[PDB]
A paper describes a structure:
The Ets domain is a variant helix-turn-helix (winged helix) structure, comprising three α-helices and a four-stranded antiparallel β-sheet. Here, we present the crystal structures of the Ets domains of the entire PEA3 subfamily (Etv1, Etv4, and Etv5) together with the structure of the Erg family member (Fev). Furthermore, a new Ets dimerization interface linked by a redox-sensitive disulfide bond is identified, and this dimerization is shown to result in a significant inhibition of DNA binding, potentially linking Ets transcription factors with cellular redox regulatory mechanisms.
Crystals were obtained from constructs that contained the Ets domain, Etv1 (encompassing amino acids 326–429), Etv4 (encompassing amino acids 338–470), and Fev (encompassing amino acids 42–141). The construct of Etv1 included two inadvertent mutations that resulted from primer impurities as follows: Y329S at the N terminus, and P427S at the C terminus; this construct is denoted Etv1Y329S-P427S. We also compared the Etv-1 construct used for crystallization, which contains two primer-induced mutations, against wild-type Etv1 and found no significant difference in DNA binding. Etv1, Etv4, and Fev display the typical fold of the Ets domain, which contains three α-helices (α1–3) flanking a four-stranded β-sheet, with an additional C-terminal helix (α4).
Residue numbers in the entry:
A (entry chain B), B (entry chain A): 334 to 426
Amino acid sequence: SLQLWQFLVALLDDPSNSHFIAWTGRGMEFKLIEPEEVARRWGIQKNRPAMNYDKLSRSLRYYYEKGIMQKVAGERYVYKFVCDPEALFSMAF
Amino acid sequence: SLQLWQFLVALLDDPSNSHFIAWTGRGMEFKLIEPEEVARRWGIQKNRPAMNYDKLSRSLRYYYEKGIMQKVAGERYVYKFVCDPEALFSMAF
């Protein structure tokens, strides 16, 4: 049972997925190029066929509160993993 | 069962442990202020009473290979957690 952040890291590690999700090249920044495709694959992963970006974005919002991620200012689908002791702790536990 | 990197993160998060292990304030860098005390507490955690800094340093060496941590060049007891997609993937999986 993967957490959504783990699942995104696994998709980001394969450049074959770069058409729907990719590291932008700027540090730990990544873009949901096809956000509905990212949702569909998350749906397959968790056996939730009714998964959509609306549900996926609520999960990405929870990740700001934990300090794991931040939404890049001025962007609809660009986020970054945070590299600080708080993010590390939330990812470790 | 905690991994050594998780154990260090847990010790680092609690300022009660700051007399023997602490974040330096420079990004993800941390210092083993009392390296033998870190080693003794790792021993308590894993029920390995014969734990010492020698055994700990070799396990830290294994984490450099994984790509999760690195020893700060020119320092005896200063390390850092790595901020890159490879580190994130190794910590996630």
